Symmetry: D2
Subunit: 245 residues, 4 copies
Amino acid sequence: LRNLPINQVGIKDLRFPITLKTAEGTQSTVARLTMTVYLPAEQKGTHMSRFVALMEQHTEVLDFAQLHRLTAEMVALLDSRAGKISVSFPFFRKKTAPVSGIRSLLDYDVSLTGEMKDGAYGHSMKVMIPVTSLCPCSKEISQYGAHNQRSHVTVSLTSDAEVGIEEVIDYVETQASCQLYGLLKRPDEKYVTEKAYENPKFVEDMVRDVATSLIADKRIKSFVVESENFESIHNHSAYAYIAYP
Amino acid sequence: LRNLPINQVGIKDLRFPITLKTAEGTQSTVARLTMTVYLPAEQKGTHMSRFVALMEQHTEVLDFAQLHRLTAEMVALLDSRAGKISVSFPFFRKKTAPVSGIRSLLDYDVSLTGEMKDGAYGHSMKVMIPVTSLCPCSKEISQYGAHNQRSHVTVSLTSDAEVGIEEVIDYVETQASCQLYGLLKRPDEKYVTEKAYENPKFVEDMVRDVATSLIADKRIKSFVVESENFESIHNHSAYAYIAYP
Amino acid sequence: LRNLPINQVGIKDLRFPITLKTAEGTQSTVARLTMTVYLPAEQKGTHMSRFVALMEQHTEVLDFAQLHRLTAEMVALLDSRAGKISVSFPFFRKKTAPVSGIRSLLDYDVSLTGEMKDGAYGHSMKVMIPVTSLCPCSKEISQYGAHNQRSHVTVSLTSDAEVGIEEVIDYVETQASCQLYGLLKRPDEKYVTEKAYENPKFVEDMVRDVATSLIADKRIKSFVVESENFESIHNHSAYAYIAYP
Amino acid sequence: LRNLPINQVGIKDLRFPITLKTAEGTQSTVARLTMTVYLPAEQKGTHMSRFVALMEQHTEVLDFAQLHRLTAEMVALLDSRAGKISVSFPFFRKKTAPVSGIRSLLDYDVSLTGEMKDGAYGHSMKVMIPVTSLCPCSKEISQYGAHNQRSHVTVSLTSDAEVGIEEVIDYVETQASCQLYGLLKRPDEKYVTEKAYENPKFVEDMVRDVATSLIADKRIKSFVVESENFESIHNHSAYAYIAYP
Ligand SMILES: Nc1nc2c([nH]c(=O)n2[C@@H]2O[C@H](COP(=O)(O)OP(=O)(O)OP(=O)(O)O)[C@@H](O)[C@H]2O)c(=O)[nH]1
Ligand SMILES: Nc1nc2c([nH]c(=O)n2[C@@H]2O[C@H](COP(=O)(O)OP(=O)(O)OP(=O)(O)O)[C@@H](O)[C@H]2O)c(=O)[nH]1
Ligand SMILES: [Zn+2]
Ligand SMILES: [Zn+2]
């Protein structure tokens, strides 16, 4: 009576090396794990060591399948009817060379969750994409030139089916006025202006475009899209988000 | 070209100094503000300048009523049906050492949110109370000693009636194995050490014990209680939360 | 023999409200304090409560004089021949209106140190200034428009004599292609492009210009100047610094 | 127009995945890189693209020698007399629980720096070891219990000879009231709790005890030892450092 069920309990912010397999190759990274389960009213404690125990044992590559695998095994190991694992980490993508084979690397911040309710599995995903946004109402008053600044686009979402980290990166960068590339001389600098100068976007635009994509994709049962446009003109961001449904 | 509502759009993390009135006095602090409005589909973009305007003008001491006032004035100006203000800040309170009674400030992190949805007002608040936790497992099994650590309890709740920040602080501080003070003399430090060793609590115990107090407060419609213990024997945290309902 | 003198010891990251007096008015803020003293080889411990004790007692406005005052009083209170106090906090500046009396606020991150060696006082200062830098080699390849991004300029320095937080802000913004103002319509936006478009600067330029000022000022016995130009084109900064002498 | 040398100029916080070789094995981690060169007075600007180039090309396991190799290759390419590379990263090591012997990784933060000054090479390294501290004052004065907390010991040193990261870890872990492990079973947790209560240490004691070990290592020319204890009875830290010489 006095004691209540605890929605979730376990470890949080355990920093752990993970080798990650996505559909454009395997890569090694450093993740930060949160791992928890439902604890019923009559049980005083969960078992804290078993969460770390699980991760130490499982040196298998982490993909969508392996994340289900761990999460079901977790509820198993700790004798609970529910629980979640989250894995946050930087994710790197190789961008092949638009000039002579000089291809740069770009870093993204990604976070995968896996959840077991009673036997039912559910997964969700969060990905932050840094982009170079350009303003179209700052080119409208100025005869020449415009207000350019770095902007971040986060995309949180839930699906029944597997959805690649990169598919989401791409969903976002497609709409990007111009995305972040690696330093290449004169050649790669000419067409970074013109792509963002004649089609520039606001914080409101960026969320709409990305949302439109996300509505289309029947796998995505729900999402949130945030864009943050760090005004160079003030020490504070322009911000907007959309949730669906 | 466009056909998508934006749930919220505005400025985020405007860092702004403020003067705050609470039951126990008035203080000067520094705040992060996020302020945003609903944006209808065919409307292309909100009016970013107007947020900042609103805040430069109002020099009024912040208080439950003032937040309401400010959030209704915000949807008015930017001409919108719904909107949100959130103000985050360190909050100070004067404490009394338990034996010697020497006075010292302790610091807390607060976030207060006002929301308007078609004339209706809601306010929620988040508060973070650092306290001490001491492990009952370590106490029991050991011929002496008990590992203890600083821990963050974070309460978020919603209410129609105003709940004082200090009120949420007392609910937590009371239940903590023991609480923190800036100033302690030998007898004080003797007191607190022994207090913790007498009243050990799992992360489960804290959130449970705090949740109950909250449930016993008719004003509170909903809450989350989190407790993170930065285990002094691990390099990760123990973590638990209860959500009501 | 086995035990050594400890250069410094005390409290670190004590978060405390301070009312700060500079030569353009008094303002209230929230500071983070580090406070320490030399501990000789024969002494096992310092006195940790006295650092907090001092701050609780002294509710006098903090200016250059008051910071000496505290620092000498500190070594006194804790019976040591040396020690330092540092105070970090955000500092706000009122920027009067270039159009009809609509004047915005901008936040800066400042940090003041005070040190007593044997009786000799020494002070130093650190100030981070956010600026809107524009590139002049990105306007050189493009016929119209250029690569604009937010950049941060930190200025650390030591003086015999008082040097105002604002004098340093100004030293930096003078050289600024354009500095951060508050949102004003059409009027204030026209001359934010032209000031940074015809005189744009790199990371190397910004450090040189600011250094030149700092060499001039006979009060400044030494400094460091850092500029960080967060490339919107990559998730990593362009960086440079100069130390003198 | 210009007449001022720049001590260092380059890119900062390039976030890059790496493979690292140490005495006890080879691991995959993620790194922040800062790379910079000396810039002579009348030379206007360094060549930012070339830093990134250098790193995309070299896929070699990182190791003491490789850092040297990389920093000499860097001044070569950018055509400069002096320069600095610094690589920061989480570092993992496999530990053995003290009683049960169960294996678990603990995580550390390392920063390795190479510097070239006119053909001469220097390397320094910084390392942060989380450990447990337990107060001897609290132990003494109290009829039972001792407040303890997690604490960060941070060692920075310079040497002509290579010092293994794990070597610096062992110097600290040994002196800690007790050390951390990811996995502990009851007997293990019993062990560590009791170990700390037996070997209590002021922040003064730790840095002192660790400093001595360092002094006893002819390879180390200079060092700083810091220890921050996140006091479980306060909301600020105790802090001390020794600098040699
Ligand atoms: N549930 C819980 N356990 C904790 C906390 N802090 C803490 O040190 N522990 C340690 O973790 C233990 C929980 O059980 P455990 O994971 O070691 O597993 P167990 O001994 O119950 O059985 P096992 O050997 O089958 O895993 C407690 O007995 C205690 O020693 C906490 O806040 N909550
Ligand atoms: N020096 C030191 N003191 C500590 C640490 N941790 C800690 O709790 N303390 C507490 O702080 C005390 C240091 O003295 P204090 O500031 O209370 O002053 P005091 O009792 O020596 O004399 P006072 O009453 O004249 O100030 C210790 O006795 C201890 O209870 C630490 O790491 N170093
Ligand atoms: Zn325990
Ligand atoms: Zn103590």
